[PDB]
């Protein structure tokens, strides 16, 4: 509308202490998620996240057939879901 939506004195007080949940977010980098690849020779398919590095890399879930070999990558290196 021409002016901002008539904001009453209720939502403001309700948003005085929100975020009472947890991490939640858009389900990206978490403990048991999915993440597609984008760089490297082990790209083209998808992967999973677990315990990443922090200020360096992360934790890629590389696996073909019935075996799997972890390959720490920074999230820039991968493709965050």
């Amino acid at each position: 509308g021409a002016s901002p939506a008539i904001v009453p004195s209720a939502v403001i007080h309700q948003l005085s202490v929100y975020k009472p949940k947890d991490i939640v977010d858009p389900a990206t980098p978490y403990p048991g998620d999915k993440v597609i690849i984008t760089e490297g020779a082990f790209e083209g398919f998808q992967a999973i996240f677990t315990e990443p590095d922090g200020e360096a890399r992360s934790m890629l879930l590389l696996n073909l057939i019935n075996k799997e070999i972890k390959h720490s990558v920074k999230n820039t290196e991968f493709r965050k879901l």
């Binding site: 597609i36 690849i37 984008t38 760089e39 490297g40 790209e43 083209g44 998808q46 493709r79 879901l81």
Partner: peptide, 15 residues
């Protein structure tokens, strides 16, 4: 579900 089109590492698209 996602808005990405190509990977631009290769041109293999994003799932």
């Amino acid at each position: 579900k996602k808005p990405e089109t190509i990977n631009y590492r290769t041109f293999k698209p994003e799932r």
